[PDB]
Amino acid sequence: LTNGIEVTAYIPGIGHNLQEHSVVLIRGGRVKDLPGVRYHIVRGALDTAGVENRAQGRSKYGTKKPKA
Amino acid sequence: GPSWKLSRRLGISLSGTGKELEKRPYAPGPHGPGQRKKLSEYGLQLQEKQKLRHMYGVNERQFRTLFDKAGKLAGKHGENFMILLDSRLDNVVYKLGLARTRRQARQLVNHGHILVDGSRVDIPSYLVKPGQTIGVREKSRNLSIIKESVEVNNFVPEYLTFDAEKLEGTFTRLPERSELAPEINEALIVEFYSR
Amino acid sequence: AVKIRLKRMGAKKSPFYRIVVADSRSPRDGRFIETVGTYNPVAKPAEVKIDEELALKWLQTGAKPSDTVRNLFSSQGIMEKFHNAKQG
Amino acid sequence: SERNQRKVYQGRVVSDKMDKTITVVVETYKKHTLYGKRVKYSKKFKAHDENNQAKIGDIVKIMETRPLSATKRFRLVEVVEEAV
RNA sequence: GGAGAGUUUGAUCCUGGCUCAGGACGAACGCUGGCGGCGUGCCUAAUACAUGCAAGUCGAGCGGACAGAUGGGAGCUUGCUCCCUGAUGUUAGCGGCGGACGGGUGAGUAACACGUGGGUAACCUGCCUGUAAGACUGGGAUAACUCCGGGAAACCGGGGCUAAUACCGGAUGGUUGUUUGAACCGCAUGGUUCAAACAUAAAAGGUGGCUUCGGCUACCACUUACAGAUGGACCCGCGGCGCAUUAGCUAGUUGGUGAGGUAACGGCUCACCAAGGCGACGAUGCGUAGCCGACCUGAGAGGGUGAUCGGCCACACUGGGACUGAGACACGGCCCAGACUCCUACGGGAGGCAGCAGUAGGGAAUCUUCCGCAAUGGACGAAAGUCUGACGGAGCAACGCCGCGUGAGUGAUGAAGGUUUUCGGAUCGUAAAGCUCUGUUGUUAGGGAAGAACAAGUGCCGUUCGAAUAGGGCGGUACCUUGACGGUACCUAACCAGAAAGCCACGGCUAACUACGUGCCAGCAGCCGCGGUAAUACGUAGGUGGCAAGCGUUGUCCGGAAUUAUUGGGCGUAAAGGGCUCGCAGGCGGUUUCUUAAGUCUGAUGUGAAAGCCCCCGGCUCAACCGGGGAGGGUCAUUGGAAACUGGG
RNA sequence: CCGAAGGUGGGACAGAUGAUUGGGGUGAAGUCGUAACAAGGUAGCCGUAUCGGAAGGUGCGGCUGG
């Protein structure tokens, strides 16, 4: 992070953009299933693209209102 | 706004008429004509709260602030909140008999202008104090919608007095909640906002 | 030094002025010594309210009003009472 | 027009050893903000003895005054009860 | 004014934590986005700043200037060019006043910094009032201006000249000091008033008008004293923090005498002595922090916060210093040292956005290099005026709150189409279309406020000055003026449902369900926990529900949580009785009575500013908001009653 | 004389980092035993000493929570 701390975050939605050395915005969200992981990567952030093929739960996972 | 749908879901005639529940008394939808289950305490309080707020068409910001201001008055709490939503000016237009719904009475206060004690009111949420002679200006003096609702004769409630031609609506002392609504259960809504 | 001066109160587009005994040093809306009543400009008529005796009390210890506060004193008529006191 | 009255205490002498002065324990005692029960606190003041007519264990009145030195703001009034 | 629910088990009751349902943000993020009002908008780097402004003003203090031409003449080409001192305007410099206010920031600061209450016989206070005495008589310089000389500049030095309301002598003075008498009064030092003498301590003129030219007067200014007012100082009671895995800390520290110093008391500073001072009621040390009115939550007690607004504080690139001035040890002043940026002719110079805009950086993250001094303040001026990034406004951002919207009445062919179906239909559902109709908003086009009162200039009238109807002050009228916002809010007419809805959830808590795909994969999740081919929990569609130009997630507060229990919990076995004693400090105290009045209760007085919460009315089209009026809040100070209880004798 | 900064010096506190190390937690059906729960096949536990790959054993005293 920008304070200097390495934490394991989580990438919630289905199929993610990220590589190594990717800019990531992190919110606080506990992932109970995987131990040691207590943040979420905000989807729709600086470089973490909005997820693919999603229409329900639009604002979470980042995707724009597609078209109709 | 469908507004038949609101009535058949809430299970109450929100106009108060033989319409909108005859031929289809179940709630809406694909899960409606089957035997629905009874609601919990939460569901009953929501039903009664939304019976009242879908009678008057209020958003919960105004509905909560009138709940609070009614708490700042004296007496019984849920009676005073009924009284404040029966001082609301769309309700005044539809209970003087100048519209067939409260949406038509909303459009009368919003643009098809109507007047209190003089100049004008463009605002449905105007709380109407007593003693206030409510009429229309000489521009919209008698036009087709107010003309129809004058031709149709409803009862004037005893907390109102209404004229046909001069069309001034004047008031009395206070609307007692015996007069206001038989179907809406108050003090389940006080309990709904008690939590 | 000590000056009876208007003090801004009210909303943005609708001003209001409390006629307020303050110092020239102190800020306009800030600290002040005592107040006399009010001044509504934005009424389409008149409506000034001056205490008219405690204002008179501050005038005599030495507190010279601003121009608009002075002519409000003249409108209620305290500068004539002050001139009658100096002619006394 | 009698002028304004200065603060006055009564107390108890801790020490005599400073030159022409004493210190005095005022035992006024007061209650809490929260639990309400009334607890005690001892406040020792520096007070001037211009005659040095004091002893340890002496009930004495003190007057407040202008600051007589560092930490001194008090003087004697009436030496009430002497130590035994 | 007080709601609970899931989860330890095969089942249960307790204990017990965890998790959820709420309200809030100076919030950010994601999806989405219509307006109007009012508020708010670098929380992070007290990081660094390009540029533009943010403090000047007075020609009624002064000298010199620049123009200018009322008349006066000048030389000729009809194109022009001066020289006398009219008004008239312009202001480098002296000088006075201001720059110490206003605006920013919260780094420091854990103690008089602040809040509250006092005390000053221990104090200062320009400008402002009000009253009383005055304002005499001279002197010598200097800026400007020139003439040199030195400097890259910054600028500096030398000789000349000149004025003041500049500065300095001098007279007269009820100050101040000394000395001697009194008189009365306290709270220890002491206080107030009277008299005398000695020693000094003032001051300035400018404008207008009257005129016998000596002067006389008003206004402003000057000096001294005494009050008021205002601002400032210092001192004390109480109060608001975490750690004891910080227990010992001080030596100008703790007192004295004397001196200096200060506006003043004081180890504030110094000499000389004494061995003191603070301390488990938490000294010292470390960490954190501007404090408060208030703000959020809560039934309240409390807990958290210290944005905006308002008071006090501290700071001004870092540390130190003084100067001047009434007041600074001075944000846009100075001198020095350090770092940084810049210029240099290498000798030396300049700078300080934590003023309003803006830039770069840090960051999840917060705005315009705008218009105006019209209004309210300020500074100066006799005033007109000038200055004013305070302030009025304007712009950007749904950042918040509030209000109006995206239609309305009628409508069964329950149209098409979606989804589902035991294929009878059910549903999206009167919701579309049909008919009728409004125009808030959208747009076009006209009309157009309050915010303005004034100042100043005239004319009156009363009045004080005056040698006087001059002339000026003071008061009342009676006119003529003044808008950045802005042809903005606002009103009126025309037109079309036309431009205007999304977000989240649907197992339970928790309102809201089906279908298709997946197959312990993809994934969801706050918890219980879903999903391994019949998934109401995953993804999609339909539907429903919640709200609504918002919605959801996050981060922190508070509640829920009686889960720090004072209100309001516990310790046989669930966590918890010291292994037990002797005891210091502390806490608690059987009975009768007298007395006291610290606690307690009660009264009066002051005060706890304004805004805020609350009550009551009023104005904005309602609302938010504004405004008026009141209430509330102290273990607060002084003062007066009670004596049951606690305490004292 | 005072005096900011700077200089020298010896200590005090605090954060990193350090070959190596010691205990701790969590993890794919790993290895060795089976110490405890029943009289858990030697009743268990508490304190203490000692020994032992390891749970543990043994002594002494105490406890029933036999």
Swiss-Prot record, chain A:
Transmembrane stretches, start-end: none
Protein name: Small ribosomal subunit protein uS12
Other comments on record: Many streptomycin resistant B.subtilis with mutations in this protein produce increased quantities of a natural (but uncharacterized) antibiotic. A number of substitutions and deletions can promote streptomycin resistance, dependence or pseudodependence; all but one of these (K55R) are associated with hyperaccurate translation.
Top-level taxon: Bacteria
Protein's job: With S4 and S5 plays an important role in translational accuracy.
Site positions for Not modified: D33
Cystine connections: none
Whole sequence portion shown: 70 to 137 of 138
Family of the protein in this entry: Belongs to the universal ribosomal protein uS12 family.
Subunit structure: Part of the 30S ribosomal subunit. Contacts proteins S8 and S17. May interact with IF1 in the 30S initiation complex. Interacts with BrxC.
Gene: rpsL
Curated annotation (Swiss-Prot), chain B:
GO biological process, one term: ribosomal small subunit biogenesis
Pfam families: Ribosomal_S4 (PF00163), S4 (PF01479)
Keywords, alphabetical: Repressor, Ribonucleoprotein, Ribosomal protein, RNA-binding, rRNA-binding
The S4 RNA-binding domain, residue ranges: 87-150
SUPFAM superfamilies in alphabetical order: Alpha-L RNA-binding motif
Assembly notes: Part of the 30S ribosomal subunit. Contacts protein S5. The interaction surface between S4 and S5 is involved in control of translational fidelity.
Protein name: Small ribosomal subunit protein uS4
Gene: rpsD
UniProtKB/Swiss-Prot annotation, chain C:
Coiled-coil regions, chain positions: none
Alphabetized PROSITE patterns for the sequence: RIBOSOMAL_S16 (PS00732)
Entry superkingdom: Bacteria
GO biological process, one term: translation
Annotated InterPro entries: Ribosomal_bS16 (IPR000307), Ribosomal_bS16_CS (IPR020592), Ribosomal_bS16_dom_sf (IPR023803)
Gene Ontology molecular function terms on file: structural constituent of ribosome
Residue spans crossing the bilayer: none
Gene3D superfamilies: 3.30.1320.10
This protein's UniProt keywords: Ribonucleoprotein, Ribosomal protein
Gene Ontology cellular component annotations, sorted alphabetically: cytoplasm; small ribosomal subunit
One Pfam family recorded for the sequence: Ribosomal_S16
Subunit structure, interactors included: Part of the 30S ribosomal subunit.
PANTHER family for the chain: 30S RIBOSOMAL PROTEIN S16, SMALL RIBOSOMAL SUBUNIT PROTEIN BS16M
Record family assignment: Belongs to the bacterial ribosomal protein bS16 family.
HAMAP family in UniProt: Ribosomal_bS16 (MF_00385)
Name assigned to this protein: Small ribosomal subunit protein bS16
Classification lineage: Bacteria, Bacillati, Bacillota, Bacilli, Bacillales
Swiss-Prot record, chain D:
GO biological process: translation
GO terms, molecular function: rRNA binding; structural constituent of ribosome
GO cellular component, one term: cytosolic small ribosomal subunit
Keyword hit for Magnesium: no
Alphabetical UniProt keywords: Ribonucleoprotein, Ribosomal protein, RNA-binding, rRNA-binding
Paired cysteines (S-S): none
The keyword Nucleotide-binding is annotated on this UniProt entry: no
Quaternary structure note: Part of the 30S ribosomal subunit.
Function comment: One of the primary rRNA binding proteins, it binds specifically to the 5'-end of 16S ribosomal RNA.
Family (UniProt): Belongs to the universal ribosomal protein uS17 family.
PANTHER family found in the cross-reference section: 40S RIBOSOMAL PROTEIN S11 FAMILY MEMBER, SMALL RIBOSOMAL SUBUNIT PROTEIN US17M
Protein's UniProt name: Small ribosomal subunit protein uS17
Source organism of this protein record: Bacillus subtilis (strain 168)
Taxonomic lineage of the native organism: Bacteria, Bacillati, Bacillota, Bacilli, Bacillales
Name of encoding gene: rpsQ
